[PDB]
Amino acid sequence: FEPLSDDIISYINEHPNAGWRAEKSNRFHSLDDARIQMGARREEPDLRRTRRPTVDHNDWNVEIPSSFDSRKKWPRCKSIATIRDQSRCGSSWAFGAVEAMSDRSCIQSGGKQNVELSAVDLLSCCESCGLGCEGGILGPAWDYWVKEGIVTGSSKENHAGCEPYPFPKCGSKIYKTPRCKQTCQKKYKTPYTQDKHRGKSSYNVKNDEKAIQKEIMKYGPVEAGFTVYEDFLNYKSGIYKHITGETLGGHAIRIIGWGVENKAPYWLIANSWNEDWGENGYFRIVRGRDECSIESEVTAGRIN
Template sequence: MGYLHILLVLTCILSSAFADPVSNDFIENINKQNLTWRARKYSDTSSRRLSISRTSLGLSPTDEKDSLNIVAYQIADGDIPESFDAREKWSNCSSLKEIRDQANCGSCWAFAATEAMTDRICIHSNGIKQISVSAQDLLSCCTNCGYGCNGGYPANAWSYWHKTGIVSGGLYNSSNGCRSYSLAPCDHHVSGSLTNCSAVIEAETPQCVKTCDNGTHLNYTTELTFGEVPYVLENVTSSIQWEILTNGPVEAEFDVYEDFLVYSEGVYKKTENVSKVGAHDVKIIGWGVDGGIPYWLIANSWNAEWGENGYFRMLRGENHCGIESYVVVAVPNLGSDSNIPKFEIGMLLFSWILYMYCR
């Protein structure tokens, strides 16, 4: 392992070990500043630890981002609406309303990717294919995606979907698909109903097993889903918007500062004099304007007890915390007849036979 890789691993370890004791005074100070967002106050007065549990690594020379095509759209004035919510446009896709939980594992890179893949399969099949893509399979089996629970590389995740494929699989303890997530949910930087993530031993990367879970009676090979060649979006707000508007949610990476961890509601913009604690990958599903402040609408993977029921909004158009600088995605490879229901295929075939007979 080279010195650079050692440095990256140490950076991840230091990020996961970051643990400034932060009292409610820190949170109250944020809320007294009349910002565009509010921090969540803990339910007790004891000192809490702000630790970002093994967040994803930042960019590195081994990431395939630099080798991917950069896509830029030429957008005419008026083509982009002032607000957009993918949950409303594609309301028949249940995955768009789902908030996942990466548990005490730095698998946000895999979660943001598979969440967007899941949405896009539904969107591009006109709601016919409601297949949950397995974060467990990507996390455990993609050997060049990074370090598993110690962080990973988003571009490599999308390339893996294109070259190798990822099976179906749902949330923890679910029977949805081939390989469901094996790590139990926990509370991320909130005092909620679950065990606090910082109180749980940090998870090891699950083992790669190319068989489906016991009891599913599914075949691993036939459960594989695939994507087309991935691409990176130009760091231009309108290009990212157009991609979401036409193809569905995208994966984005941004720098995380300590105040973000206690976000509760509003349009997030980092406060002054806060420390950077790592990087994080999320799924952007839309945008809007609140009180004159443009924002991105984003799904996090820290369960629904964090933020705005699992979502958050971040300042849009200024590449805040780097949110617009690293957006990677692909369209699903659904096969030639994936957008046509089998019933319709049968009716088309019957009509053709009838036509030939009656000629």
């Protein structure tokens, strides 16, 4: 099937037991449109393995609930329910990171901190993280948060904090990574170096369902990567699994919990294509099967 065609949509909607529903995309008009709006690549297996530890929470013998929603456990951390838009910049690697990091800053401090970390700062300033708007790597984003820190910064539309996103929420423009500045916006009086929020640790989470589950419910939303196939471009609702189409590359998102619908287990994930995309900004995807490698590259860290 041609991607984003009436025909691929029809195939999906007539497919027995797809588990999800396709709709004409309101964001992508070509394969090119979507290629630019992603931005994750697997970390080299050895480097990933040797740069930070791998947590499994084996030694924590807790009951895992059949469903969990970070928004429910920590309702007063507003960032958890905040959906961002990456624009036409392949920076989902940075977005996934700063989102979960903002979550955890609130969660792991009992709400004493409540902050929006600047996407542009991580994607512009992190050299070891990859190619900025041309795609990136999860692990080094978190190592960076620890070593260097990330400043405050809202969406373009909000104009808040040190470095708000310089690209607007959804033309044909292809955004080039901005140069790393170490200055805030004129109006934001707190100086850049002071404005740095640092993590105390970063780690891989074992490619293991239970391990990912324990990590989220205790420490908050995690970042993860997955492979996007052509059918994903027309996902609107339901529990995604790959049915047809080939790889378009990798994408990084934020897993905020999980559950089960009509006997089918899923992860609940915030995407970075604004609140009009998918299920009010979120999407669900098969859990426990390593679907599209969603469970392969989970990445996080803590502030204490």
